[PDB]
UniProtKB/Swiss-Prot annotation:
Changing C240A: Abolishes interaction with ERBB2. CDD domains: MEMO_like (cd07361). This is Protein MEMO1. Belongs to the MEMO1 family. The gene is MEMO1. The modification Phosphotyrosine is found at Y206. GO terms for cellular component: cytosol; nucleus.
Amino acid sequence: VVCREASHAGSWYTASGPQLNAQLEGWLSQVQSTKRPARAIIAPHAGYTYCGSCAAHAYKQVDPSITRRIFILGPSHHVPLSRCALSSVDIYRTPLYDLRIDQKIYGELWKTGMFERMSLQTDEDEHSIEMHLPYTAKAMESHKDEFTIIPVLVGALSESKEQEFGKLFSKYLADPSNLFVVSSDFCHWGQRFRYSYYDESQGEIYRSIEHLDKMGMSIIEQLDPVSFSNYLKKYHNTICGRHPIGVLLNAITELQKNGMNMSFSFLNYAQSSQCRNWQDSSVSYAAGALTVH
C-alpha cells in the first residue's frame, strides 16, 4: 500500500475539498504576515471547528516560495512509543491534494537507526500529524509540485532522547528550504483530563489557565529546553506536544551554539471555551513561528 488515507477527514475536519479550501482561506485571510519566512511553527491539532482560526496565525507565516520540505512532528496518543516512528507509505492523502514523503530525507533518517517504522494501521489511527496536512497543502498551493513532507511521530521521549533527536534534526533545521511543524495543543483543563490546577491569584479559572499557558509559552520564546522541562516538572501542564516541543527547543539551542540567531514568537492564543467552575473543561491552543536571522 502506497497511500495513507485521510482517516480523520469527515470527523475532525471537512471531507469536502472545495469546502475545506474555502474554510482555510477564510482563516488565513484574517491573519497578517509578520514572521515570514517561518523556519518552524507550533500549531494546535484539535478539530478545525475549534482551533482552525488559531492555527492560521502560524501557517500564514510560511512562505510558499522558500519552503521546500516540511517536517511534521506530532505526538502519539494511541501507541506506546519510547522514541520516534516514520511512515511506511509514500503518500499522505488529503481532500485538497495528496502529499509526497521526501524519500531522500526518509532514507537518511532511517539509517540513523533511531526510529521505528509505524505500521499502516498505527499511522492512519493517529491524528496529530494528519491535522496539519490540509493546512500545509493550502499554504503551499502556489508551489504544489515543488515540496515534500517528512512525517515524524514523536513518542514519550526521555530527556536524553529529546536532546538526541534535537541534535539530529538540527542539521535539517539549519537549511532554509526546510520547515518544522511542531504539533501540540496547550492546557487540557478539567476533571475529565484529571488536571485542575488553579492559581487563584490569577482571577477566574480561565484566567489562571491563560497565565499557566502564557508562562509555558514565554519559556518557549526564550528558546530554553531545560527551563521548559522544569516548567513541566513544576506544574505538569497538560501539553500534548511537550515532546516534539522538547525536540524543537534542543534543535534550536544546538544551532545557537553555532552563532545562528533566532526568535520564536507566539502570535495567537485561544481557548475552546471559558472555564468558570470545577465541572467546566477546555483545551487551549497557541500558534507561533520560529524565525531565523
